[PDB]
Description:
The complex is a heterotetramer.
Chain A lengths: L1 E2 L3 E5 L1 E10 L7 E6 L6 E6 L10 E6 L4 E9 L5 E8 L5 E3 L3 E6 L8 E4 L7 E4 L18 E2 L6 E5 L13
Parallel strand pairs in A: 2-10
Antiparallel strand pairs in A: 1-3, 3-7, 4-5, 4-8, 6-7, 8-9, 8-10, 11-12, 12-14, 13-14
Chain B lengths: L9 E3 L9 E10 L4 E7 L2 E2 L9 E2 L5 E9 L7 E7 L6 E4 L4
Chain C lengths: L1 E4 L2 E5 L4 E7 L5 E7 L6 E6 L5 E3 L7 E3 L7 E4 L9 E7 L8 E3 L3 E6 L9 E5 L3 H7 L1 E11 L4 E5 L17 E2 L8 E10 H5 L4 E8 L17 E8 L3
Parallel strand pairs in C: 2-11
Antiparallel strand pairs in C: 1-3, 3-8, 4-5, 4-9, 5-6, 7-8, 9-10, 9-11, 12-13, 13-16, 14-17, 15-16, 17-18
Bound molecules: ligand 2LJ.
Amino acid sequence: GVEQPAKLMSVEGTFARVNCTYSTSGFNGLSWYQQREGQAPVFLSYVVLDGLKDSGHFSTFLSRSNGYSYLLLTELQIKDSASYLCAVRDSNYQLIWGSGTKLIIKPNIQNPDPAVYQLRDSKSVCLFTDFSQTNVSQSKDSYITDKCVLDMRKSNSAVAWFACANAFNNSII
Amino acid sequence: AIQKTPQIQVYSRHPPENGKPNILNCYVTQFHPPHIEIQMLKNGKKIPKVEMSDMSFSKDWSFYILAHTEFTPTETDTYACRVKHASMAEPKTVYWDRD
Amino acid sequence: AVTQSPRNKVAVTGGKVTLSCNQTNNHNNMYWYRQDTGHGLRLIHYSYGAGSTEKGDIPDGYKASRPSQENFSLILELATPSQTSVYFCASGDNWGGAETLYFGSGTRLTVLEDLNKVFPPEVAVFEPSEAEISHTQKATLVCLATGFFPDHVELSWWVNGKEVHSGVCTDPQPLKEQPALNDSYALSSRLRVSATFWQNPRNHFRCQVQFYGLSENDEWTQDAKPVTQIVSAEAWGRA
Amino acid sequence: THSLRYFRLAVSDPGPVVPEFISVGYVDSHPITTYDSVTRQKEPKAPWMAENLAPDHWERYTQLLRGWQQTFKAELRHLQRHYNHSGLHTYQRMIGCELLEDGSTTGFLQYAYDGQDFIIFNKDTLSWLAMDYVAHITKQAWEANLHELQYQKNWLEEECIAWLKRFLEYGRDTLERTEHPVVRTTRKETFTTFFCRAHGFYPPEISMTWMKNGEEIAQEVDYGGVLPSGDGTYQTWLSVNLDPQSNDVYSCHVEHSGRQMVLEAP
Ligand SMILES: *[C@@H](C)/C=N/c1c(NC[C@@H](O)[C@@H](O)[C@@H](O)CO)[nH]c(=O)[nH]c1=O
């Protein structure tokens, strides 16, 4: 009875809005949970009235009549990279769990330096690193993993294992 | 702690035609705490067919319960309703008057 | 707070599996869910108190009991495929309509028809590229764990005895090496250190992969004994 | 007007005919549901409840009610500590909403300890009203749940009424039924008392303005409330005292559901 989107992209900083639309028999409250990729879901906020709960860190506005709510996540970061689960309560107190929206956060890079290096062995893997519109793809039915971001004391990557400059089916740039 | 004295009210279901069967009700009201003992009497004997209702709640935190029994009214046989409650140190008995 | 045991399980079709949960939180509400790809969390069994087990949306094949106030166990009498999911245990503050569920760490259960397919991983670690050191002024290491099935593995880096998390960028979900049938999986984690850190040959780098597999109390006639094991491939710096 | 209520009862002693926990719901002063520690199953108290409610409603709302049985027994064991009380003590609860005429709705939620009021919830101020020092500790603890208070305000204002209207239409045949009264008048001898009696009507509402002569209402009277007959119908009586030597005639003027009747007075 609860429908929820499944993908969301945003820029580090900025903000994002995960949505949740319910069609339950009744309404006793709407709760938000955040699940970080194999960790247990963590309670985020609860809304049952019409207004928005300004928690500073985030906000959650609800619409009784229109029948939907959105979570205003702001000041995004790597920690704010998860899927979000909303659950509404039936007139007979049954939790209706939505599917979940995967909010992927885009790493803002101030020196995009598309460089592909031939990694050694210790077997020659290829590490497309430090390229965020550069969308990678898996192909050739060999082995291309997807993008990821790391931290320092902030660079992307794409490991894959022809030669490094084989120009695979991914839209390289 | 707080105890309220009941309100025994004994009457008949249908207007009595002496020698024709009837059901005489004993409608106990306004009692608290909820525990109570109600017994109906016929000429002093204990009527063994007293059927009580389930205990009901009132908005004033008091309870009310209606106990009845089938009876055949005559011109001599008297009927009463004895109720023992924690509010009273002795059971209270109310007799039925035809009026 | 709320913990689950066992954290991982690999059992044969038609076996006895018991998934138990424990709560330090003095809550009297405990639920069992199974989160599956596609449709979201689906309740299985719960309880409102000790000895008050009830059913849920999917009680098919599952039975539950609550011995004490801090124990609610999911008992799979006859295990089957498609009973394999991530099982989350949640506690509930008895706030009625308001309810803050406290979920415990997930339990990856896998039911296999033949236990021979369970494969531990093979770990390989790849030294940096000299061009990257010259260009990036940093060295991006890469560790590849391949040939493991089921996907109950966790990759971690161990630099000089310390589990580094600075630049570690393990792939979230593994990928099947041969995308057909058993389809042994493979995952790829990457660590990018500064050039100076790799140049010193005294800094020791390690890629640890923890594999949860066959329990010791299981039959294994073939050959060999692919039980839970930590497998690694070390790497030292080189100028 | 119409009203839907749900009551709860926790007592310190399971002494017979009063279980340890009781919870009954009432629609328009009529029983509908029931639950107690003896049955541990919510059951219907009216035929128009088990017919218009499928087995799932009864199944899931006992699973909740048993959760409330332990919760309610626990709150009684809490208050007895703050008063150092022992023996028998009653812990009550009343919640519900009433849809009046004119469309205006109300909501209420209050507790009671030993009959007297203990704490009362205010949905329009999102606050609890305490009665003594112990009830104030409860206020300073229940108020600390903004999620809780908002949930209840939603239920009283928005969701309870949906249950009331859903319940009125179900038993519309019984709750909107019209049974006309049976009026007989009898005579009692003073030690000159004329009674007007009515049996077997249903709405519990009747007017027995007892007249005198032709067109003069008699001032002095006696009244008895609408005592329930027990089959679903109600009865009443009202007795004037005729003047000892006046020889003025009397009548009864019973009106009920828009059908007035006029009777003789011997
Ligand atoms: C079956 C309809 C019985 N219901 C029942 C209720 N229902 C209302 C319930 O949701 C509220 O009391 C609760 O949300 C307050 O936190 N209440 C009750 O007290 N007893 C009943 O049997």
